[model samples]
Target: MVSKGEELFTGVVPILVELDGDVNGHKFSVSGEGEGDATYGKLTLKFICTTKLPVPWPTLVTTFVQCFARYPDHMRQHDFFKSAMPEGYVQERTIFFKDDGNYKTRAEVKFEGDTLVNRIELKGIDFKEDGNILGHKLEYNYNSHNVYIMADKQKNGIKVNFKIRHNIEDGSVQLADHYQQNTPIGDGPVLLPDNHYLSYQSALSKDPNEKRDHMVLLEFVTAAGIT
Candidate 1:
């Protein structure tokens, strides 16, 4: 799965932590020498898990903390676009989580950017019963169309903002209908794409109907010159 400007990271093993119910915790360790230009840079990360079978209350706590820890990478993306492409690009990501008593999942992405910059994060939380989706919900923030300039010595990047909290406590019961609406797309489980470089069309839209629209992508070039 090597795409231009994108590096493939390995050395990740799925850590399975068994708990009550069907959920189990999973972790992917990314290691090994990077196979890329090292001009744009890469980062490696570890998804820390607090519980195997997580309840909504506990799972929320983990989700919030993971988001905060990955702020650096979000900020770096802003810098990259400002230095390289001013017109703005599209970046898409999906975070996955499941609550079936074990609260187990392998839904984190990390990269070892230039100089071993370790940036990491996780997202999403879904619930089910008898192989049927009972509930599901996800919360994330992004920044798009963040403008910047490297030549003028002005700020090199933009900022990453998040959406106000969004959740489906009884996901199966409350969000069940909403999930059905998206089934036509047929995208299984909606997993977030890690480093799936964004483009202009998907960057941000002027559409007014879109909520969770607060995610902004800042543009800037890292002072260290790493993408």
Candidate 2:
């Protein structure tokens, strides 16, 4: 659950959930304001992460921003061809590009003046770990075991996965893990307590620019962008 805490900033109070004491550890904060009678409010969350070793934050943000921000150029190419498919391909379908090309999928980190880089390789559809659209709940798995929270912005939150490779070996690759608060929602049979605050699993772009098995998925009502 939820933890009570002092004001995280000037006027906002915080409800914190922590995995460990380090700022690099998994944690979430919901900040809001109100009195007894008029209790209208807005919620803001912050997520930061670090790795067992130095992580590439700036580069990572840059890469993620670059890849997702330019979706039309890279991901939406299939839309133009949907109407021209051959006979057998006329069935209702969603086309996703493969990750084997000249595309550059990279993420880097920038902290206290230092920078590091990381690369993302979209594997393929992971039917098992990816959330299923059953009846209500969206279920997916992730293995961000050694990752940590490093820094944050005022309204926008941040998340980082340092040990990019541990995702494969660690059975720690279960349904929810660090920064689980930001994981995609609305693809499964049952929704959880935090689903509304989070983007749905259907939003994730299954393209070459994405990670192979990292399984970071999200959905939005209208557009697909970072929440």
Candidate 3:
């Protein structure tokens, strides 16, 4: 990998985490990015969401915090559109980030987007180089994690205010292991195009006590640019 002569690798990986279950008697799914996430462990993520019914923010954040920390098994915690808040309406939108640190949001195509996390280090495999494995690569490995959520209806519309928390500094988490989602090309260490990669669909979280069941899907993809 010439890597523009600097030898440093240049590529951005997208790890999509989604949950599949039900919404108002129909099959529905929610998604987010699970690429770079956590420490003693701090986790981070991004999403685009819609609120079909108005919801109270308090209970929502709490469940999320727990599930977000599901793997960390430490935080234990955590949509919809429909003007149904008036009784609910369906809201649709695009990619964005959650940053309480900044006053404004960073979004693409706009929607009730969510700030999205989970920690999985993408490690590269041995390259067929000159008598040696070469260059940098990506891998996917995860610990125990689960998603817990509460879908409540309030006077306002669905409050899928999915803002996430990530900072430049957090003494956060660590990891190892590798999933070679990338298909090696002819060269010893050439970056490939964005691939379908891999995905993990989690079982829905349910209880004898509650009606809302939650699930998750984590996607790991590889992309190349700045060649």
Candidate 4:
């Protein structure tokens, strides 16, 4: 049975389901990392996906960025509690898409009591599909648990729909837990001995006037206050 904060810790990966049949031999890999704060009793995280295909990178990145924006709200719609979430339980999120001269978007999400509210914006590049360019906008309602994406592409319409549901089984829990536990500690400078040495044999092969013919042996050291 799912418990309080259990779902928060439970990790999931998204899988692509071709509702309209596959257009190409495309593949997707979804992964995420999260951390919790005891002081605030909250969790902070983000998920990312890598797509391998003949399609341009910007197109795929933009599509996935929109998808990731709704992930948190989607997870909340699930039955992640044995009974029901606490009366005042809430989750806060701030998601942003990195702009590489292609895609730029951001969202501010808040789970207030039993409702999830989000303010999302897309700017810079427009959505493109099959040589068609379109302006993008989002429509969502917390009660419906769905995010509808509308893009204005003339002859070929673009209407993307996203719903809350289990995308994949929670198999990464153990892996994520182990990684968190083994995370290295950071707090000091590191010193190394015998950092440099002068070689005499190589000095003989150089010009007799070349007195600075010393071979330096360098040792690596961690920077101060870094892990």
Candidate 5:
């Protein structure tokens, strides 16, 4: 018999290492660590892009608000809002939701003007779906133009966390793989409506036969002022 939490893995596949967008201007890339099985042990990503503040400050703030709400995970990881607010200011917000199956999720954001903070919480029905519960929190900051981020994740009794720092002009964000250790995974680049662009690349094994022993490199980039 299939267990309650088993359904979550029913159609899941090895996450593919991927890259998206034109390399001429802005782009993003991802690379995996050299060890592991069918998946990556560690992944690093980089982003190089720009954002243009619209004519109205309110419009710009509105865009920032909406973008953060829609892509909280991405923004938290990439420091997308690092340049949006003044340094030293701080703000915090939280959200909660419950679906039909007693599944509940709560997300929180704590922004320190130039710095950033984020977290997520999840709970399943009883204890069956409970083992699958997952929660993560991320903190991002900058020194001069260099950026730093630290994140922690807890699932059941397992816990993991890592810290990475990179330059704003050019640097990488690193991530650690837990359950999906041997599975390749990735997401395509995201195109912004503000003429600014975002893209990423993931590292995969060049040899089809040796999937476990692979070199991984991940990068994310953004660019503006492109006609």
Candidate 6:
């Protein structure tokens, strides 16, 4: 039950699906934006999310400002062996008006970092009755409840995430609830803090300096404020 012009208060939230792995020979840790092209029924149209930038892991040949960089660090280390960085697919969507006061939406994302994740099958996100728009209502779920993620090279590549939000609202990003915080719950995935824009691990470092995660989050963009 919302009033006139009250939909803008909810903001847009784009779901991101981040992962790190090897494809053929070029290893990349790309973040895929969850997409909801209005399929199915009941509580579709998730929030709108924005992509700050593209975060690529240093695996195959890379570039340096203008000069290209080769693989294998000085210590002969590779990022394909590390899984402490973003790996969980991230996403989000907004709900407006008196339609479904509960605010339920499904999450889906597709990224083509060299045809990265072939496809990731995810379910809907249920907002708690007592959930907080500031607290941990937003979160990072990894393979919980039969989450699916498939990857390949050039088999079926797709477009990246979209950033279609207008001016800033409160500056503070709203997110869902997760089981873990800055730290991680395991060592097989990426561990990223929700503060950095393109925050991610090198994946080539033998001893990392920071933590990481798959980065499954919810963003409230201004577009979702519509009717």
Identify the candidate with maximal TM-score: 1
On lDDT, the candidate that comes out on top is 1
- The Cα local distance difference test for each model comes to 0.24, 0.19, 0.21, 0.22, 0.21, 0.21
131-190 per-residue lDDT for model 5 (tens digits): 111111111222211112222112111111112221122243312211110000112121
Using all chains and alpha carbons, the TM-scores for the candidates as numbered come to 0.21, 0.17, 0.20, 0.20, 0.20, 0.20
The segments of candidate 4 whose C-alpha lies over 4 angstroms from its true place after superposition are 1-3, 6-101, 126-131, 135-227
Model 1 agreement with the true structure over 1-227: per-residue lDDT tens digits: 22212222122222221112223223322222212222332222222233222323223222210111111343343233222211222222232333232222222222223222222233223445432222223322222221112221222222222221224433422111101000102211221222222211112112255342121221221222123
Model 1 residue 14 CA deviation in Å: 23
lDDT of 2 by residue, 95-126 (tens): 12122111122112111111111122211121
lDDT of 4: 0.22
RMSD after CA superposition, every candidate: 17.3, 21.3, 22.6, 24.8, 22.7, 22.3
Off by over 4 Å in 6: 1-78, 81-114, 128-168, 176-227
Instruction: Tell me the spans in candidate 3 whose CA falls farther than 4 Å from its real position.
Output: 1-15, 24-27, 34-37, 50-227
* Candidate 5 clash figure, as a count: 37
Better of 1 and 5 by lDDT: 1
Residue 114 miss distance in model 4 (angstroms): 0.7
Q: Which model is ahead, 2 or 3, in terms of lDDT?
A: 3
- Candidate 4 lDDT, 1-227, residue by residue in tens: 44453343233322221111012223333332333322222323332332322222222211221111212222322211111222211111121222212323333332334322223333333223432112111111111122332322231222233222211122211000000000001121111111121111100011245343111111111111111
- By summed lDDT, the worst window of 10 consecutive residues in model 1 runs over 175-184
Give the Å error, residue 121, model 4. 2.0
